[PDB]
Amino acid sequence: AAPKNRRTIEVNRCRRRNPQKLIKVKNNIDVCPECGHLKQKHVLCAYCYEKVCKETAEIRRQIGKQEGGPFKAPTIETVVLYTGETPSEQDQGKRIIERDRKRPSWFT
Amino acid sequence: VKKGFRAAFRFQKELERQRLLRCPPPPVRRSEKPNWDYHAEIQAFGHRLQENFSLDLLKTAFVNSCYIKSEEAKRQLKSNQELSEQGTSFSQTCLTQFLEDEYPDMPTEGIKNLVDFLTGEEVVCHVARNLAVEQLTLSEEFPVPPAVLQQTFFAVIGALLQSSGPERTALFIRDFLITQMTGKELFEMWKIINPMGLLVEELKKRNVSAPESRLTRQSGGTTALPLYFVGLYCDKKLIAEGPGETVLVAEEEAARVALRKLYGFTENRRPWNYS
Amino acid sequence: LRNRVTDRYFRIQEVLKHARHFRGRKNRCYRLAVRTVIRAFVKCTKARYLKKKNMRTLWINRITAASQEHGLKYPALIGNLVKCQVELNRKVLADLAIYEPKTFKSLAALASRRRHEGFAAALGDGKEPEGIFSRVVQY
Amino acid sequence: IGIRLTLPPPKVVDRWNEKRAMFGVYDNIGILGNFEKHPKELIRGPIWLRGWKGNELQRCIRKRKMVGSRMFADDLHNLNKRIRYLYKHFNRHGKFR
RNA sequence: GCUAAACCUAGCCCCAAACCCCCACCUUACUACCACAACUUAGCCAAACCAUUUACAUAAAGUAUAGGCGAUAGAAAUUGAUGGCGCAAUAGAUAUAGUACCGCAAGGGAAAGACAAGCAUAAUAUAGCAAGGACUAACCCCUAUACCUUCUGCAUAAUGAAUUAACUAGAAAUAACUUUGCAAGGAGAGCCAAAGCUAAGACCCCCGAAACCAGACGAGCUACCUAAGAACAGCUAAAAGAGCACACCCGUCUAUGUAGCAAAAUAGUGGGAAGAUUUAUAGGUAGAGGCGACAAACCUACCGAGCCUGGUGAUAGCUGGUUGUCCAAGAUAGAAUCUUAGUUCAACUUUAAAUUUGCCCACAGAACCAAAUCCCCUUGUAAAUUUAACUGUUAGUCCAAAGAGGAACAGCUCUUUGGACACUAGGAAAAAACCUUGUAGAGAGAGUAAAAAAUGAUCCCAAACAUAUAACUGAACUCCUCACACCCAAUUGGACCAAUCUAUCAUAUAGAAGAACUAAUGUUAGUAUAAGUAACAUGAAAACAUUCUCCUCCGCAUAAGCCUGCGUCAGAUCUGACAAUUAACAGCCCAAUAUCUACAAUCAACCAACAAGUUAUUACCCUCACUGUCAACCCAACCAGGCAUGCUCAUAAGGAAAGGUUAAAAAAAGUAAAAGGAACUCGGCAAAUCUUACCCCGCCUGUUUACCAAAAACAUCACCUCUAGCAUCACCAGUAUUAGAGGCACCGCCUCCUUAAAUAGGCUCCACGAGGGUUCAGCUGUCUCUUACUUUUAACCAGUGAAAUUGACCUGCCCGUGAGGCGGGCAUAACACAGCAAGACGAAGACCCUAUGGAGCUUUAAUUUAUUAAUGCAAAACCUGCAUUAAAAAUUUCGGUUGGGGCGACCUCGGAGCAGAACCCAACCUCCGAGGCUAAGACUUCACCAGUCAAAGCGAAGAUCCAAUAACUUGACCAACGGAACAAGUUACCCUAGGGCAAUCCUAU
Ligand SMILES: [Mg+2]
Ligand SMILES: [Mg+2]
Ligand SMILES: [Mg+2]
Ligand SMILES: [Mg+2]
Ligand SMILES: [Mg+2]
Ligand SMILES: [Mg+2]
Ligand SMILES: [Mg+2]
Ligand SMILES: [Mg+2]
Ligand SMILES: [Mg+2]
Ligand SMILES: [Mg+2]
Ligand SMILES: [Mg+2]
Ligand SMILES: [Mg+2]
Ligand SMILES: [Mg+2]
Ligand SMILES: [Mg+2]
Ligand SMILES: [Mg+2]
Ligand SMILES: [Mg+2]
Ligand SMILES: [Mg+2]
Ligand SMILES: [Mg+2]
Ligand SMILES: [Mg+2]
Ligand SMILES: [Mg+2]
Ligand SMILES: [Mg+2]
Ligand SMILES: [Mg+2]
Ligand SMILES: [Mg+2]
Ligand SMILES: [Mg+2]
Ligand SMILES: [Mg+2]
Ligand SMILES: [Mg+2]
Ligand SMILES: [Mg+2]
Ligand SMILES: [Mg+2]
Ligand SMILES: [Mg+2]
Ligand SMILES: [Mg+2]
Ligand SMILES: [Mg+2]
Ligand SMILES: [Mg+2]
Ligand SMILES: [Mg+2]
Ligand SMILES: [Mg+2]
Ligand SMILES: [Mg+2]
Ligand SMILES: [Mg+2]
Ligand SMILES: [Mg+2]
Ligand SMILES: [Mg+2]
Ligand SMILES: [Zn+2]
């Protein structure tokens, strides 16, 4: 059907500003104790995750530049090595994806 | 644009009125606003009270040392100290005489307290604002500080005394200061603590044992809104009765009423005789 | 446009000023403010009659309470104070009951006295001497 | 809100210009002039209203008679329609018969 | 604090004066370049219909005169002739512009530029028209049935309003009254004058029909037709309006959708699909007309008569509205009327003025055949009559009483006497109508009036009380202190006045006028409510190169349409600049004259048919110019719709059904289902399965109500009837075996069973039917009786974000009154979210009545023959004028009271009971007939018009208008008897304005 009467600003305020409709204050924010950026407990530090995705993208660009075209999933493991890092004794027989910047401190 | 002028001017006046309710101007001496001539004002101050002030003494009774100093400093005559002293001293003596004769039994401490109340700042400032002393008085800071109003008011009483003699001044004091006792209870002007002690002292002076506090009536003993009616006694004869919510407060009030009855200051005392 | 009302604002504010204290849209919208303001003033006029009626009924209640405090109903008090030619009205009777208990005690005693005199007289045979309080004073 | 806020500019009227200082002069040219002229012969204005008065119907009829043949086509058609309407109204509508 | 609010001029209105202004373009307009013509206003509207009729200087004069002598129309002789008490951006022109935009078209036609509402700051706390009395105190207590308009009053019975701002509705004569001048004369020629004249002042609204007539624009949709084109796979069958079935066309049944994807679509199921088929392109028919396989079907979304402009501000006895303050008088006899939805007269009301009796009222008095009434001396009173001048109301409801009608009842129709209501206030519960009470202000004073019970269906309904002296309570009545014009509708009189302009001051005195908005489903602009609700959108991963999953009757091109509408760059979340589409394809054509021009196409050969389908002569020896060329596109307001042809027939081309989540209800689509298999239901609608038999109608294929009917209707071969003997614009380049107009519908023959149970089914005449009815067998979630899963919807998170609706709301239940809001009881801390549909008479379409509204249809209703066709008569072998007869049309109307509206009666006047006793009083209540002249004074049919009696005195014993008339006067109709001069039946296609306590009986004691 249709309304029988306009609804006043008072009723509309008792509806719109009722607590159930308010935005709740979040009790689960904190500071990355080492890195020092904001984060929720159960979620990754956004800044750290972005700085990881950047390096993943650069590595993957090198991988694409080396594999040539599509349909070339290798049949061996892969290892990524930064400048001035000779292939360790454990990484022989694994594809090497050379990169041209110093290894990040967070890359172990 | 609607053509016209009357509605525009009317709206401007209404806006000005509203703008003089929010952001009111800083209050300023009545002796600066328009329509002011001191001579007519002081003469009218005289004639209004039904008193024949001597014009020169009344003139110098509204001038204060602060104003003289500020005039001396701002430029690059007598002051009202002596009149103020005479007026304050006479006011104290005459009020003491009035209260003593009206209330004989009251102790000298109580009479002195009443006299300090009536001649205090809280009441003198009230009687001095509602008789246009602030408008005529000369000072530095407006509003005039209550102490300066007090000293100017008693300077005016001193001028009145030096002009028209003691009896007329006494009538003036009866008319403006004593009237302020109207309605007030005794212990709203004579602020005391520990009333039961004072009752015991006064009863001892009259050579009778200290009073026994009993419980005359009670309702709602356990609730949060009790009523205890505590009645003092003096050798099997009542001398007071007080209400309260705690028994301690009821006893205190019984002491207060007994003190009032002994000092002749009850609620239903013979009202002062102004005629 | 030759003539246009240049001051409709003031004619509106003459009616809104009496509605600032209302609740709803009918304290700022003229079409509703007018109707409720008119009802307000009609009740304001018509309410003085009720003011008198209500204060009188309050006084009758207070006087009934006070008179019952002294074992004497309200019919007796009024219907036998006038028989003693006391023209105290009800406003002042209520004020006496609240603020002067012993004076009201005396008035109640007087009423009971006159009531007893009336009963004794009517119980008798003839026109035996009238009661000491039942003697009228003529103008 | 329908009320202006600032004050209007002041309309200055010069009560002693030539048009006002000499108003009415020669409005007794008849009585004081041996009746050579008549006051109506000083009324400046429309050809069909100099010294004549009437309600709208008579005014329109007079306009039609005296300058109807000089009017623009659309104005003249409006005038004829107006006369038709006024005739109907003044002769059939109204409180009083 | 936002939103806003404010401003000036750009210009315009009315006067005066003056008479105004390179190229291309009628073909397809804006295109360099080849053989016809132009020359009476009808009608809306008045007469309350309508038919003759009806309007387009001053003075004479609204006179002569015309006229259903009604409404109204109306002369002449003669007379004499630069400005603004304007607008200032919703005004003024429509204007910044006849642009944007709407329409195919005629045509329509804008907007704008310089702390109002709404919100936030600041959500709410029992209870209730949201206020008032108040109070120390916001709520709590007591009082309190929203506003406008229409009906007798209306609880909201109904209509209207979300809210703010701006704009929006009383114009004028004939008399009269008031104040001036002059006064037997007034007036600045015309006119009036037995105190009148001259001047001024005062008084007469807004929005809205269906319609009518005239001239333009429309057949790009649809109906039909013309010219020249196009499409129709495969199978079966071979020349057929053949069968099954694609493309294509239509639109049977169901479901979704109902502001939707769409102002008629989607999904399935269906009919046709070589023909009476379907279809692209240009042309034609034009509005009382076209077209029509007749359905009142269609003619550019709305056709029992298109659309636009004009007459037009149509008219409206109908609906709705109508704006400052205050006071005062103020209401229900009646008559006539194509009249009862209205008008006029009277009665009543109001104002001003004159005069003297007015009301009440005893005694007396009013007929022969109960209440009271009439009439006046006094008396209480102060009013009444008369004159001058206007409007407004009029056939009201309830109660007491007496009657008539229906029982002496039906809350019943009507007449009469009185009261009340529509005016204040208090009571009986709420309460217009009963009882009490009126003349109005303030009081925190007082006295009273009326006023209390006795001894069937949601949920009983104030709580209680047998025995302390009878008085008290109780109003706006009355008294008291003060002040006084300060409580009716329609109407009428009066005193004031907001704002603007002008004159003079320079806010006042005057003069003016677009001069005042709580209300017209008013208009324009702003912002709300429903609402952050309904709805919408982006396949996945990624290394932004790419890969993967899935889908399509799709895609590419030409045509038609559109006109730069996802190319680059630069600014943003679309704006500007730059760039582009290259002719061989397609369009743009042709020197003249005569001649010819018999045989089809279908693989064109066999058979077989019917619908029958260019050159010889003369003239010219010139060369490629011009235009289209783009795209994601067009018609549908932006779109699950519409869109011709060629080719690909499932794709070499093209795309994305899920924004993220969870897996509630109700809803939608689909899949599965135990046993039973129509017991569902109006019906086997839907679904699953595939068979049979009959009956009614129509012969068959086909066509129809674009958008509720596809049929038993239309058409159709066959048959029959009627008319017609014949030239160059149709029939027809036809000729009785022909053509046109009708009816019918080939052909032949004549002019008890069924079920267990049953109101259902049961001229011959093959074939066919989305036609109607019935039956066998099967089948199935139709059902007994529902259940699970999936998808969309859904609910939550994020983005974007409407609309109907809305008087205000601080929005309860039960019982009673007449219901959330009144009364009496009960209940009651505030607040979201998702559901439901009992209530908020919750938000299009019907039916009855009315209008002296509209439009029709038929006629044996009235008027006409103007136009046509015959004749007849004059006119010089043909046309002109007159007359008669006919068809064809054209204009026009539809009286009143009523069983239950219809049928049928009556309609004027008169006499008897109602109406007992001056007057008057209804009936479709009760019973019957009729059609000499002059003159004081009076009566009356409740008006007027008519009508009636009459002393004396003088002389003898059913209207008006019209016609014939010398006349003295005269008549019919007007009987619908206050009378249109002459008009009926009907609207199932209708449109607009509006209104809406039972005589006789059933049953129990
Ligand atoms: Mg009273
Ligand atoms: Mg007419
Ligand atoms: Mg404009
Ligand atoms: Mg405009
Ligand atoms: Mg505001
Ligand atoms: Mg209601
Ligand atoms: Mg409404
Ligand atoms: Mg066509
Ligand atoms: Mg009208
Ligand atoms: Mg009528
Ligand atoms: Mg009155
Ligand atoms: Mg008499
Ligand atoms: Mg009175
Ligand atoms: Mg003024
Ligand atoms: Mg106006
Ligand atoms: Mg409005
Ligand atoms: Mg909702
Ligand atoms: Mg949704
Ligand atoms: Mg080209
Ligand atoms: Mg070519
Ligand atoms: Mg191309
Ligand atoms: Mg592809
Ligand atoms: Mg999608
Ligand atoms: Mg979703
Ligand atoms: Mg099953
Ligand atoms: Mg068929
Ligand atoms: Mg069929
Ligand atoms: Mg959301
Ligand atoms: Mg009820
Ligand atoms: Mg809800
Ligand atoms: Mg009628
Ligand atoms: Mg009619
Ligand atoms: Mg009779
Ligand atoms: Mg009669
Ligand atoms: Mg008569
Ligand atoms: Mg005679
Ligand atoms: Mg008649
Ligand atoms: Mg009659
Ligand atoms: Zn971190």
Swiss-Prot record, chain A:
Listed under GO biological process in this entry are: mitochondrial translation; translation
Annotated positions binding Zn(2+): C32, C35, C45, C48
- State if Oxidoreductase is listed as a keyword: no
| Record's comment on post-translational modification | MRPL32 precursor is processed by the m-AAA protease (composed of AFG3L2 and SPG7), which cleaves the N-terminal transit peptide. Cleavage by the m-AAA protease takes place prior to assembly into the large subunit, an essential step for mitochondrial ribosome (mitoribosome) assembly. Proper processing by the m-AAA protease is dependent on the zinc-binding region within the tightly folded C-terminal domain of MRPL32: zinc-dependent folding halts degradation initiated from the N-terminus and triggers the release of mature MRPL32.
Subcellular localization is given as: Mitochondrion
Specify the superkingdom: Eukaryota
Return the similarity comment.
Belongs to the bacterial ribosomal protein bL32 family.
What is this protein's function per UniProt? Answer: Component of the mitochondrial large ribosomal subunit (mt-LSU). The mitochondrial ribosome (mitoribosome) is a large ribonucleoprotein complex responsible for the synthesis of proteins inside mitochondria.
This chain belongs to the protein called Large ribosomal subunit protein bL32m
Which species?
Homo sapiens (Human)
Full-sequence range covered: 79 to 186 of 188
Curated annotation (Swiss-Prot), chain B:
Instruction: List GO terms (cellular component aspect).
Output: mitochondrial inner membrane; mitochondrial large ribosomal subunit; mitochondrion; nuclear body; nucleoplasm; nucleus; plasma membrane
Q: InterPro entries of this UniProt entry? A: dsRBD_dom, Ribosomal_mL44_DSRM_metazoa, RM44_endonuclase, RNase_III_sf
The record's subunit annotation is: Component of the mitochondrial large ribosomal subunit (mt-LSU). Mature mammalian 55S mitochondrial ribosomes consist of a small (28S) and a large (39S) subunit. The 28S small subunit contains a 12S ribosomal RNA (12S mt-rRNA) and 30 different proteins. The 39S large subunit contains a 16S rRNA (16S mt-rRNA), a copy of mitochondrial valine transfer RNA (mt-tRNA(Val)), which plays an integral structural role, and 52 different proteins.
Which protein are we looking at?
Large ribosomal subunit protein mL44
The DRBM domain sits at: 194-264
Q: What does this protein do?
A: Component of the 39S subunit of mitochondrial ribosome. May have a function in the assembly/stability of nascent mitochondrial polypeptides exiting the ribosome.
Tell me the organism's taxonomic lineage. Answer: Eukaryota, Metazoa, Chordata, Craniata, Vertebrata
Q: Name one GO molecular function term.
A: endonuclease activity
Q: Name one GO biological process term.
A: RNA processing
What gene name is listed for this protein? MRPL44
* Domain of life from the UniProt record: Eukaryota
At the top of the EC hierarchy, this enzyme's class is hydrolase
Swiss-Prot record, chain C:
Q: Which GO terms describe its cellular component?
A: mitochondrial inner membrane; mitochondrial large ribosomal subunit; mitochondrial ribosome; mitochondrion
What are the GO MF terms of this UniProt record?
Answer: RNA binding; rRNA binding; structural constituent of ribosome
Q: Would I find Ribosomal protein among this entry's keywords?
A: yes
Record keywords: Mitochondrion, Ribonucleoprotein, Ribosomal protein, Transit peptide
What is the protein's major site of localization? mitochondrion
Question: What are the recorded Gene Ontology BP terms?
Answer: mitochondrial translation
Spell out the Pfam families in the cross-references.
Ribosomal_L20 (PF00453)
> Is-annotated flag, keyword Transport?
no
Q: Please state where this protein is localized.
A: Mitochondrion
For this chain, the family text in UniProt reads: Belongs to the bacterial ribosomal protein bL20 family.
Q: Which NCBIfam families match?
A: rplT_bact (TIGR01032)
Quaternary structure? Component of the mitochondrial large ribosomal subunit (mt-LSU). Mature mammalian 55S mitochondrial ribosomes consist of a small (28S) and a large (39S) subunit. The 28S small subunit contains a 12S ribosomal RNA (12S mt-rRNA) and 30 different proteins. The 39S large subunit contains a 16S rRNA (16S mt-rRNA), a copy of mitochondrial valine transfer RNA (mt-tRNA(Val)), which plays an integral structural role, and 52 different proteins. Interacts with OXA1L.
| Designated name of the protein | Large ribosomal subunit protein bL20m
Annotated gene: MRPL20
Curated annotation (Swiss-Prot), chain D:
* GO CC field: mitochondrial inner membrane; mitochondrial large ribosomal subunit; mitochondrial ribosome; mitochondrion
* Keywords assigned: Mitochondrion, Ribonucleoprotein, Ribosomal protein, Transit peptide
Which organism is the protein's source?
Homo sapiens
Q: Where is the signal peptide?
A: none
Tell me the name of the encoding gene. Answer: MRPL51
Which family would the database say this protein is a member of? Belongs to the mitochondrion-specific ribosomal protein mL51 family.
On subunit structure and binding partners, the annotation says: Component of the mitochondrial large ribosomal subunit (mt-LSU). Mature mammalian 55S mitochondrial ribosomes consist of a small (28S) and a large (39S) subunit. The 28S small subunit contains a 12S ribosomal RNA (12S mt-rRNA) and 30 different proteins. The 39S large subunit contains a 16S rRNA (16S mt-rRNA), a copy of mitochondrial valine transfer RNA (mt-tRNA(Val)), which plays an integral structural role, and 52 different proteins. Interacts with OXA1L.
Q: Where in the cell is it found?
A: Mitochondrion
Q: In terms of one coarse class, where is the protein primarily found?
A: mitochondrion
Mind telling me what this protein is named? Answer: Large ribosomal subunit protein mL51
Biological process according to GO: mitochondrial translation; translation
The molecular function terms in GO held by this entry are: structural constituent of ribosome
